[PDB]
């Protein structure tokens, strides 16, 4: 536990949260990061943390989830933070404003956040030109094991969900190492209910067909991102379509519209998606079903309440080849990346794993 770690957690972070509403704090976090105002990442990634999945090297499995850098403004500062991969978005075809403020709320007693941004996005065009300005720098980064994922969404007013997702595949597909069809946002009318078996099958057919129309070196992988609120019927059906259509992987899982017993924050009854520790195990259990339903054959990026190596390692052993975090960064600050990696590596060694790859799905073999 470094000096940066304890300093950012016990002093810097609680002071910023004391002066700043969460949306303001988010906006500043992005600026600082875009400018590279960040502490030294004194963790040097080891060979044990290397993962080869989705036709790519990841030099560590700890990524920043979608929603932090919605518009592509701080990608390089996030690699410098120490993440092994970066996912930007959600991006919607047309620019849109999102929900009226206030739309973000802290539950500090729960290590939790509730948000209803409602897909505030600069739009495909602005993000496309943003990413084009660094497209070749990113080609090198990918080669070095730091890939880039782009998360796609649809417009509030949009009439045909699949045409929104196809536009995104066409415009930002050539710039991404993987694309994410986000059919799980709680904050858009109709979006989570983008799994009507044959509905989801039709949407994902048009996405994969669009993706295959791109030139070989600009063909990303395509993932689906699902909610932790799914019935057992829904998960069985998602598993079925994913294997039928050859979907390249699953991101598990977006925030929850549930409110687990025991939440203590005053703001717990705010409308929106809950993230952080109340999501952790509900997240880990969805990795676990999805892995089993797909016979461990569909890569999974696990996400939900990860703030430590134990949290990351439980998700990997439950099926994840990669993990993401977001909420933990808003309490710990940048040092949380090095902290999770350092702890992940130590646990891998004590539990007898040769590396991350040996531990993927390990719980399903005990
Ligand atoms: C030189 C230096 F010392 F300044 C280096 O400091 C840094 C460097 C880099 C980043 C940060 C930084 C920060 F300033 C923050 F305000 C936040 N807070 C939030 O993002 C936040 C929150 O609070 N609620 N919330 C709810 C929803 C979404 C986001 C958030 C943060 F996550 C940060 F990572 C600080
Ligand atoms: C403020 C905020 C904004 C988010 N925006 C998006 C988004 O645009 N697209 C998406 O797929 N997930 C979004 N998420 C969900 C996260 O990507 C993630 O799935 C879940 O919050 C992360 O688990 P964790 O925050 O507990 O680490 C957002 C989450 C928060 C807290
Ligand atoms: O933009 C949002 O409000 C949003 C999107 C999403 O996928 N998840 C979330 O928690 N919020």
Description:
The protein has helices at 3-19, 22-35, 75-81, 124-132, 135-143, 161-172, 198-212, 232-245, 280-293, 309-317, 327-332, 336-350, 356-359, and strands at 51-53, 56-58, 62-64, 85-91, 104-107, 112-115, 148-152, 178-182, 221-226, 249-252, 273-276, 300-303, 322-325. The strands form 3 sheets. It has an 8-stranded parallel barrel, surrounded by 6 helices. A 3-stranded antiparallel β-sheet has the order 5-6-11, with no helix packed on it. The longest helix has 17 residues, at 3-19. Helix content is 40%, strand content 15%. Helix 7 packs parallel to helix 8. It has a single domain (1-366), classed as Aldolase class I (TIM Barrel). It contains 13 helices and 13 strands. It is globular. Strand 12, helix 10 and strand 13 (322-325) form a beta-alpha-beta unit. It is an alpha/beta fold. Orotic acid is lined by residues 90, 115-119, 182, 185, 187, 254-255, 273. The site of orotic acid (ORO) has 12 residues, from loops.
């Amino acid at each position: 536990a470094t000096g940066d770690e304890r300093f950012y957690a016990e002093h810097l972070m609680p002071t910023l949260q004391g002066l700043l509403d969460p949306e303001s704090a988010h906006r500043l976090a992005v600026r600082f990061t875009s400018l590279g105002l960040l502490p030294r990442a004194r963790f040097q990634d080891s060979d044990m943390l290397e993962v080869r999945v989705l036709g790519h090297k990841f030099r560590n499995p700890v990524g920043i989830a979608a929603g932090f850098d919605k518009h592509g403004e701080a990608v390089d500062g996030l690699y410098k933070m120490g993440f092994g991969f970066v996912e930007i978005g959600s991006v919607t075809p047309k620019p849109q404003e999102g929900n009226p403020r206030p739309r973000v709320f802290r539950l500090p007693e729960d290590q939790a956040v509730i948000n209803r941004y409602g897909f505030n996005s600069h739009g495909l065009s602005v993000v496309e030109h943003r990413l084009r300005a660094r497209q070749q720098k990113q080609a090198k980064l990918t080669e070095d094991g730091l890939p880039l994922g782009v998360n796609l969404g649809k417009n509030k007013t949009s009439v045909d969900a699949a045409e929104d997702y196809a536009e995104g595949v066409r415009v930002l597909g050539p710039l991404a190492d993987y694309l994410v069809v986000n059919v799980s946002s709680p904050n858009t009318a109709g979006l989570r209910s983008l799994q009507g078996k044959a509905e989801l099958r039709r949407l994902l057919t048009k996405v994969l067909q669009e993706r295959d129309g791109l030139r070989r070196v600009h063909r990303p992988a395509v993932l689906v991102k699902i909610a932790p609120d799914l019935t057992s019927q829904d998960k069985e059906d998602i598993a079925s379509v994913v294997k039928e259509l050859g979907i390249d992987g699953l991101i598990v899982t977006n925030t929850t519209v549930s409110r687990p017993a025991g939440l203590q924050g005053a703001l717990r009854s705010e409308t929106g998606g809950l993230s952080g520790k109340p999501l952790r195990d509900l997240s880990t259990q969805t990795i676990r079903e999805m892995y089993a339903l797909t016979q461990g054959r569909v890569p999974i990026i696990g996400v939900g309440g990860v703030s430590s190596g134990q949290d990351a390692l439980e998700k990997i052993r439950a099926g994840a080849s990669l993990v993401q975090l977001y909420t933990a960064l808003t309490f710990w600050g940048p040092p949380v990346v090095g902290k999770v990696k350092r702890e992940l590596e130590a646990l891998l060694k004590e539990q007898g794993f040769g590396g991350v790859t040996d531990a993927i799905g390990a719980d399903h073999r005990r």
